[PDB]
Amino acid sequence: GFLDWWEDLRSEMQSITDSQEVFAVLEKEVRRLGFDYYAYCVRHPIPFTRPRIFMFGNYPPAWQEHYQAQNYFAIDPTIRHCLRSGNHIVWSDDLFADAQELWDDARDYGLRHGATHSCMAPNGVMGFLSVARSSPAISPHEREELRLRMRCLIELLHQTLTELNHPSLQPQPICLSKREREILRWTADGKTSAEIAKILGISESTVNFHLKNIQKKFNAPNKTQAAAYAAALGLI
Amino acid sequence: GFLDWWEDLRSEMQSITDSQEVFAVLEKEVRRLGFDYYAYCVRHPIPFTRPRIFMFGNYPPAWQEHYQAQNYFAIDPTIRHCLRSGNHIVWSDDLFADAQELWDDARDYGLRHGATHSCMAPNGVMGFLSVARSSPAISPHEREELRLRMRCLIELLHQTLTELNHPSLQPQPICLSKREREILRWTADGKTSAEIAKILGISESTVNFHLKNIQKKFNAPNKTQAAAYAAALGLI
Ligand SMILES: CCCC(=O)N[C@H]1CCOC1=O
Ligand SMILES: CCCC(=O)N[C@H]1CCOC1=O
C-alpha cells in the first residue's frame, strides 16, 4: 500500500544519477497518480526586483509555450509566495479571480482539474509541484490521499535534485568562513564595523577586509546587498 | 494502514479550542511512536545572532533549564537551518563530533537515542520537532518509517497552530508601504540611493528620507539591517 509505494520510490531516486532520470520517474508516478500532466516550478527570493523563476514539466507543448509568451507566470495564483492552508490547494474557478484570462485559456487546453503543493527549502528555495488533468474531478475521498502522496513527491524531488546538485535548487553558491560568517551576522543586525571590531576582537581594519571579500563573492558593490542576499538564502 | 492513521490524526486535530490540548495529543502520538520525551521549537530568522526561540515540550524541566542556561540552543547540531540532509537527523553518536559538551548532559538526563525533524514556512518561521528515549536504539527499517510519521506531525503542527493563530508563530508586524517596498528592493539589490533616484523620478533626498522611516520601523540604526531584516521576513 502506502508503505510499499514510498519504499520502491525511495529506491529509484537513490539509484539514479542524472537529472533526466528524475523527471522521467516523476512523470511515471504522476501518471499512476491518475493525472495527465504535471509541472514543477522552483523560484528563488533573489534578486528582489527579478526573482528567478524556473520551469520544468510535461504540459502540452502548445501550452508550455503559451504560458511563457503570455507572461502567465506573473499573474498565476498557483505559483504565488503567499501562505497556503497546508501548502496544498485544488484548482477552483474562483481561485483565478484576478487572473480570469489564465484560467479561461487553460480549460480549453485540457487542464480542467488539478492541484498544487508547495514545499519550502531553508535556502530561499520554494518549490511548486502541479498536477493536471481534464476528464476526472478531484473526488473528496481522493483529496486527502492526494495531499499525502504529493508531499512525498516534492519532498523526494527536493532531496534528489539537491543531492545531485542541479543548478535550479542551488541559488548563488557562496562559501562562507567561520570568521566571515560571524562578521556578516553583526553587520546584518545593524552593528557598525568599528563596533564589530570589539565583539570579535579582530580590529576594524581586518573586519572591513572580510566584508569586502564577502562583497566580492556576492557580486555586491556594497555591504547592504551582501547582507540582504545572505539573509534570504538562510546562509546566516 | 498509514493513510488511515493520518486521516484519523488529521480529523481529531481539527478541534480548534485551546493550544494546551494540541500539545497533549502530540504527546500521545510520540508515545505511540515508542519514545519517552519530545520537544518542539519555533525559530524566527531574526535576530541573526540570537534568534527568537519559543520552547515547548515535555523535556525534564531541569534539563530544559540547563539546556537554556548554557545557551546550547546556538551550538547544538540537532537544529540546523542548513544542509538539511533529508530534513531528518537521526541523532548519531558521531553527529555530536566536536563541541559535544551537551551530549554528556543529554545522556545523563536520560536521552540516549532520538531523532529531529525540521520544516520551513514561506514567512521565514521555522519549526523543529524532536522525540527522545533511552531504552532501545533506532532500527533502519523503522527509521525510514520514522521519516514519514514525523514529517506528517511537524507539518500538521504548523498547520494546526497556524489555524489556531498561536502567537509564537507570528513574526514582528513590520509591514512596509508600496513605495517603501520598491525602494527597499532596490537598496537591497546593491544599488545606491542616487541611482534609485534615477530609476524612479524621485530626488536623492526623498529616497534617503524613506530609508530613515524604513529603519525606524525595524528600529535599525543603519540601512543594512533594514534590508537584511525585511528579506528574512519575506517582505522584499
Ligand atoms: C505551477 C505551474 C503553473 C500552473 O500550473 N499553472 C496553471 C494555471 C492554469 O493552467 C496551469 O497550468
Ligand atoms: C532539535 C531540538 C533539540 C533536541 O532535540 N536536542 C536533543 C539531543 C539531545 O539533547 C537534546 O536536547
Q: Report residue B110: phi and psi, to 5°.
A: 100, 30
Calpha distance A163→A131 (Å, rounded): 24
Amino acid at the residue A24:
A
Q: How far apart are the CA of B22 and the centre of ligand 2, in A?
A: 21
Closest CA of chain A from B62, distance in Å: 31
Same domain for A53 and A109? Answer: yes
Are A118 and A227 in a shared domain? no
Residue A226 main-chain phi, psi, to 5 deg: -65, -35
Q: Contact at 8 Å (CB) between B187 and A223? A: no
Instruction: Measure the CA–CA gap between A151 and B160, rounded to whole angstroms.
Output: 17
Alpha helices (H) along B52-177: 61-69, 101-108, 140-164
Residues framing ligand 2 (Cβ under 6 A)? B 39, 41, 67, 76, 78-79, 91, 106, 111, 116, 128, 130
- Compute how many other C-beta atoms are within 10 angstroms of the C-beta atom of residue B235: 19
CA distance A101 to A82: 21
User: Read out DSSP for A167-229?
Assistant: GGG--S-----HHHHHHHHHHHTT--HHHHHHHHTS-HHHHHHHHHHHHHHTT-SSHHHHHHH
Amino acid at A215: Q
Total domains, chain A: 2
Cβ distance A49 to B186 less than 8 Å, yes or no, reads yes
Q: Which residue, B142, B172, B202, sits at the end of a domain?
A: B172
Please state, in angstroms and rounded to a whole number, the distance separating the CA atoms of residues A184 and A234.
Answer: 12
| A131, three cell numbers | 498536477
Residues B16-25: contacts with CB under 8 Å, at least 24 apart: B16/B160, B16/B163, B16/B164, B19/B161, B19/B164, B19/B166, B22/B157, B22/B160, B22/B161, B22/B164, B23/B56
B36 and B148 belong to one structural domain = yes
- Which H/E stretch holds residue B223? helix B223-232
Amino acid at B25: V
| Residue with cell string 538526563 | B109
Residues of A in contact with B236 (CB under 8 A): 48, 228
Structure determined via: X-ray
Quickly tell me which residue has 515535555 as its cell: B58
Phi, psi for A90 (deg, rounded to 5):
-100, 150
Give me ligand 2 centre to Cα B130, in Å.
7
- What is the DSSP track for A32-82? HTT-SEEEEEEE-S-STTS--EEEEE-S-HHHHHHHHHTTGGGS-SSS--S
Residue pair B26/B33 in contact (Cβ under 8 Å)? The answer is: no
Q: Which of A78, A93, A111, A118 to mutate to test the pocket of ligand 1 (most atoms within 8 A of CB)?
A: A78
Closest to A122 (Cβ–Cβ): which among B7, B81, B192? B81
Last residue of a domain, one of B119, B147, B172: B172
Q: Which three cell numbers stand for residue B25?
A: 495529543
Do both B134 and B180 map to the same domain?
A: no
Query: Which residue segment(s) compose the domain that A194 sits in?
Result: 173-236
b or e along A126-139 (b: 16 or more beta carbons within 10 Å of the residue's beta carbon)?
bbbbbbbbbeeebe
Answer yes or no: do B152 and B197 share one domain.
no
Domain boundary among B124, B150, B172: B172
Q: What is the C-alpha to C-alpha distance for residues A114 and B23, in angstroms, rounded to an integer?
A: 34
Integer Cα distance of B155 and B137 in angstroms: 25
Resolution of the experimental structure, in angstroms? 3.5
